Amino acid sequence: FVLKTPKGTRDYSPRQMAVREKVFDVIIRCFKRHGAEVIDTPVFELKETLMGKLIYDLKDQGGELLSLRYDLTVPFARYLAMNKLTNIKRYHIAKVYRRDNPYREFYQCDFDIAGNFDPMIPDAECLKIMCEILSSLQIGDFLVKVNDRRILDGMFAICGVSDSKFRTICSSVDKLDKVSWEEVKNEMVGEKGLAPEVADRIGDYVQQHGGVSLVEQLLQDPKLSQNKQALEGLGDLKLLFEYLTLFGIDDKISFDLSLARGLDYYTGVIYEAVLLQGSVAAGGRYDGLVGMFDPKGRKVPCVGLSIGVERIFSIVEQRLEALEEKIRTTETQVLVASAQKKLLEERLKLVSELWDAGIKAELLYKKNPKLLNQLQYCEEAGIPLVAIIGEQELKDGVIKLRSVTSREEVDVRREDLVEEIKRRTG
Amino acid sequence: KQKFVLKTPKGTRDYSPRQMAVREKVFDVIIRCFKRHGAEVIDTPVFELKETLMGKLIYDLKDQGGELLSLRYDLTVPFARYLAMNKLTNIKRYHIAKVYRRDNYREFYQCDFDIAGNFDPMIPDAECLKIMCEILSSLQIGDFLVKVNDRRILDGMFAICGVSDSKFRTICSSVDKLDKVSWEEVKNEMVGEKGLAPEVADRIGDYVQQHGGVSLVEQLLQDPKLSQNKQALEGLGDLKLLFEYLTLFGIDDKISFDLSLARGLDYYTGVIYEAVLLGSVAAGGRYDGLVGMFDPKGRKVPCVGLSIGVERIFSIVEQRLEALEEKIRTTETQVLVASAQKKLLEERLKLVSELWDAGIKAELLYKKNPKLLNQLQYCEEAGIPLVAIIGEQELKDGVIKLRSVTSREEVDVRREDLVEEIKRRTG
Numbered sequence A: 001f002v003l004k005t006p007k008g009t010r011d012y013s014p015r016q017m018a019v020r021e022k023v024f025d026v027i028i029r030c031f032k033r034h035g036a037e038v039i040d041t042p043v044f045e046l047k048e049t050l051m052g053k054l055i056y057d058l059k060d061q062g063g064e065l066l067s068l069r070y071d072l073t074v075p076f077a078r079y080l081a082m083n084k085l086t087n088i089k090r091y092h093i094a095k096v097y098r099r100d101n102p103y104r105e106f107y108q109c110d111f112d113i114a115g116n117f118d119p120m121i122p123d124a125e126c127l128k129i130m131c132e133i134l135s136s137l138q139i140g141d142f143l144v145k146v147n148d149r150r151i152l153d154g155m156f157a158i159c160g161v162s163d164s165k166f167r168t169i170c171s172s173v174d175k176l177d178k179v180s181w182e183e184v185k186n187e188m189v190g191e192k193g194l195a196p197e198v199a200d201r202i203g204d205y206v207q208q209h210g211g212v213s214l215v216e217q218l219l220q221d222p223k224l225s226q227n228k229q230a231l232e233g234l235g236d237l238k239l240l241f242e243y244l245t246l247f248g249i250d251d252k253i254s255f256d257l258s259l260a261r262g263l264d265y266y267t268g269v270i271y272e273a274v275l276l277q278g279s280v281a282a283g284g285r286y287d288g289l290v291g292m293f294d295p296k297g298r299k300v301p302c303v304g305l306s307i308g309v310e311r312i313f314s315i316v317e318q319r320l321e322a323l324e325e326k327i328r329t330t331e332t333q334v335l336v337a338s339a340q341k342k343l344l345e346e347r348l349k350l351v352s353e354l355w356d357a358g359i360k361a362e363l364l365y366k367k368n369p370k371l372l373n374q375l376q377y378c379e380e381a382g383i384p385l386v387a388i389i390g391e392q393e394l395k396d397g398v399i400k401l402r403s404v405t406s407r408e409e410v411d412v413r414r415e416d417l418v419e420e421i422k423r424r425t426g
Numbered sequence B: 001k002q003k004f005v006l007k008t009p010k011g012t013r014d015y016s017p018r019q020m021a022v023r024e025k026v027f028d029v030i031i032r033c034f035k036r037h038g039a040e041v042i043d044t045p046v047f048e049l050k051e052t053l054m055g056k057l058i059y060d061l062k063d064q065g066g067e068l069l070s071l072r073y074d075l076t077v078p079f080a081r082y083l084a085m086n087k088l089t090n091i092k093r094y095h096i097a098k099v100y101r102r103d104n105y106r107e108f109y110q111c112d113f114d115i116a117g118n119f120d121p122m123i124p125d126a127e128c129l130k131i132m133c134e135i136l137s138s139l140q141i142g143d144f145l146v147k148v149n150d151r152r153i154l155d156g157m158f159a160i161c162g163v164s165d166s167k168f169r170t171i172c173s174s175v176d177k178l179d180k181v182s183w184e185e186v187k188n189e190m191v192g193e194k195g196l197a198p199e200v201a202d203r204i205g206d207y208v209q210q211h212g213g214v215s216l217v218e219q220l221l222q223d224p225k226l227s228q229n230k231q232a233l234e235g236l237g238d239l240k241l242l243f244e245y246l247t248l249f250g251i252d253d254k255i256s257f258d259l260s261l262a263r264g265l266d267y268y269t270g271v272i273y274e275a276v277l278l279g280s281v282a283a284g285g286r287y288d289g290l291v292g293m294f295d296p297k298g299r300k301v302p303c304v305g306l307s308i309g310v311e312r313i314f315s316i317v318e319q320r321l322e323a324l325e326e327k328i329r330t331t332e333t334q335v336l337v338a339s340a341q342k343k344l345l346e347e348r349l350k351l352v353s354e355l356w357d358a359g360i361k362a363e364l365l366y367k368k369n370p371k372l373l374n375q376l377q378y379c380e381e382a383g384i385p386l387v388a389i390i391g392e393q394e395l396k397d398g399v400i401k402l403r404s405v406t407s408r409e410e411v412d413v414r415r416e417d418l419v420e421e422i423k424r425r426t427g
Helices: A014-033 A047-051 A073-082 A121-136 A149-159 A163-170 A196-206 A212-220 A228-247 A309-322 A344-356 A371-381 A416-424 B017-037 B050-054 B076-085 B123-139 B151-161 B165-178 B183-193 B198-209 B214-222 B230-249 B288-292 B310-323 B345-357 B372-382 B392-396 B415-425
Strands: A044-046 A066-068 A088-097 A105-114 A142-148 A253-256 A269-275 A281-285 A302-308 A334-338 A361-363 A385-389 A398-403 A409-413 B047-049 B069-071 B091-100 B107-116 B144-150 B255-257 B271-277 B282-286 B303-308 B335-339 B362-364 B386-390 B399-404 B410-414
Touching: A014 A088, A014 A105, A014 A121, A014 A309, A044 A047, A044 A073, A047 A066, A047 A073, A073 A088, A073 A105, A105 A121, A105 A309, A121 A142, A121 A228, A121 A269, A121 A281, A121 A302, A121 B345, A142 A149, A142 A228, A149 A163, A149 A196, A149 A228, A212 A228, A212 A253, A228 A269, A228 B345, A302 A309, A334 A344, A334 A371, A344 A361, A344 A385, A344 A416, A344 B123, A344 B230, A371 A385, A385 A416, A398 A416, A409 A416, B017 B091, B017 B107, B017 B123, B017 B310, B047 B050, B047 B076, B050 B069, B050 B076, B076 B091, B076 B107, B076 B288, B107 B123, B107 B310, B123 B144, B123 B230, B123 B271, B123 B282, B123 B303, B123 B310, B144 B151, B144 B230, B151 B165, B151 B198, B151 B230, B165 B183, B165 B198, B183 B198, B214 B230, B214 B255, B230 B271, B288 B303, B335 B345, B335 B372, B345 B362, B345 B386, B345 B415, B372 B386, B386 B392, B386 B415, B392 B399, B399 B415, B410 B415
Parallel strands: A142 A253, A334 A361, A334 A385, B144 B255, B335 B362, B335 B386
Antiparallel strands: A044 A066, A088 A105, A105 A302, A142 A269, A269 A281, A281 A302, A385 A398, A398 A409, B047 B069, B091 B107, B107 B303, B144 B271, B271 B282, B282 B303, B386 B399, B399 B410
16 A cells, blocks of 8 residues: 555645636636626536546545536536526636546636527637636737638538548547648548548638738638538637727637537537637536436527636746745745744744734744744745844834844834834735 | 436535535635745545555445445545555645435535644644634634643543542533533533543533633643543643643733543544634644554554634625625626717727736626617626726727726726726726
8 A cells, every 4th residue: 555646636736726826816706807707616517418538537435426526517517407597607616527538627717608699799708718817827928720610511511521430530630730731631541531622612611710800801702602500600700800809809809710619519619719829718608408307308509618727827837936036925024033042932922913904914833943943934935024022122112123035123112022023014 | 117307316415606605705715824834735536445444424426336435524644645545644635526325414524633643742733723823713703712632631520529430421412412511411412422420520610610711721730630640630730831832932822721622533643633713613632542543553643723613714704794784796797898879889899808818807798789778787796896888989099998896987088098997997
């Protein structure tokens, strides 16, 4: 027996938590700016709700057959139908459980707008949220790729893709973000085996990218014009863009006739965020799912987004690591210390007074520690200030304040100490 | 052939927006306080390797071929593992996460804070109670007490009275029953439970029924019979010390020494305490035997902490907020951008994002040409303080009408000053 931490999971050390909290604020702060409610489902659901092989089921033991949440949407769907809710605007930040082999337990963090409203407003609302978040985390410049479901289905039918192949062929064009075409095309003649012309026909569309001007192209496009499905898709995006502009977000999104992710969740718009030298953020419209868990069969429309928080964490830690910025684990502002020996009792009386005042203070749990040890504790923890008590200082109504970085002491009258401590900090 | 239903696994409930709101209010009071005491924070995963937790009320996972795992039932065993794996002498941490117990809740938030390390006598344990009274005070539920005791005394006092060792555990089991029940009832339980001779029962009754502050310990040190037990003495001293530190902390008056308090007797080895509102609101104490035990070379890690019954506190706050008749908002949105006229959605969109860019928590109905009254009601239900009204003629004059949802009053306000003036009105 070896002391392990279940294959595919790692703890968050205090440094690591300290990073996630910096992250989650930015994220949450932003959600709350857009008026989302927040929910929480339990960690497991009945297995019966997640069936109708990469899921952790739980042993029998007599009760019901449960299994851990792999999703944050399937719980969101259950929540909505249990509580018979027409519409809702929620985010939910929680750990999710996939049994992959390439994390196995990892934070997913999504925000969704369930409900029935006019076309693209919430969809555009979503994109502005990602851009807010991706900007405020500061992690560099980003693009946001945008497709639409109806488009793919429509064009593939125009170039001439069978349905059997369709969904296995769009998954080919979906690795085009990381690969090249002369490769992609050949993994389309060995895989399923397109004809030389049909592959070309697809390529000649898919390799195009850019913004608003591209979408104005494909309508005026002769070939793309006389097909009902995809045209409707293009109209949606024409609208989506005007909305985006009023948001000032036009410049940060690009239309990619190539993006074909979540092909089995999405019904309209699709998008994936991209950082500039992966799946930092992704989402889109999926009107099919809510819908399913409801008894009667009444569709519930939804657009959303999730943020790959675990990829983000490690980009941030690293950015600070590079910056030689120390990442403090504790928030403590003052350490109450003393030079001489029999003074604990007075140090105790002082911390309590600081705490009572809302000052983030601390104490070394010894009688008679030595000042070098106490200053060391500080220069390590990142504590800015030390409050030294000493017999002479006390019979003076005075407490010495020494700054750990500057090493300068100032003696401060008892009362003022609180205002003076708070004044240095903020 | 099997009736499928939208259930949520037995002994588990979701958190609704309103319940999340409350829990957020509570967790802040808690955490804000740990942070004031300089605690670090850790996160274990939700499951461990079965064998870690074992060496029946434990959620196992299906084999499926990998390693055999089970859901954490406790926050301490993962604490133990975090220490051995990271080769750590000491730490001052808090950890607030859900736990899993197949009971007769099954998924309930636990929230404990711990001081692990090898320090002098009672300073951690004192700094622990001071944290309790800080939290229980801030949460603003009514007055409270923290009952205190020390394992070494129970061990001493029972042995002096003449309870067997076998009998030992059940007998405290019935004196811990004594908070809820009357001594006549307990006593009889002890002579219908095991069979403590009435005299052993009576002797216990004399001690167990007393309670007070320092002076009760000052007394139990003068007690002829107690003093001559090495164990009881060591403990009483530790309390006598714990108290002087508590006075310095000015918490003295909030805690009463209750010799009857016999909870947690496999975990705890020193101080034991439980808060009592005036429930299992908060509990804790010294358990030196448990962290170490997961170390290779047998090295003991002494430790004292507390956990706060966040589950019970959650309802006390909601109940208190309902009663106080104060509407609990589920969203922080400060402004709805709205209009009265028709062709206006587009200028409303310009405005919400302008407000977003300034960090204002703003909102807007997902509807082209909504009706003012519909908009306005949305704010009364939401709790939204303000409504920004766009109108063709206001917008040519560069003005926006600001209407205060509760006072119903309109001020037309220039575009630049709107953000700052909205901010002046909120905070």
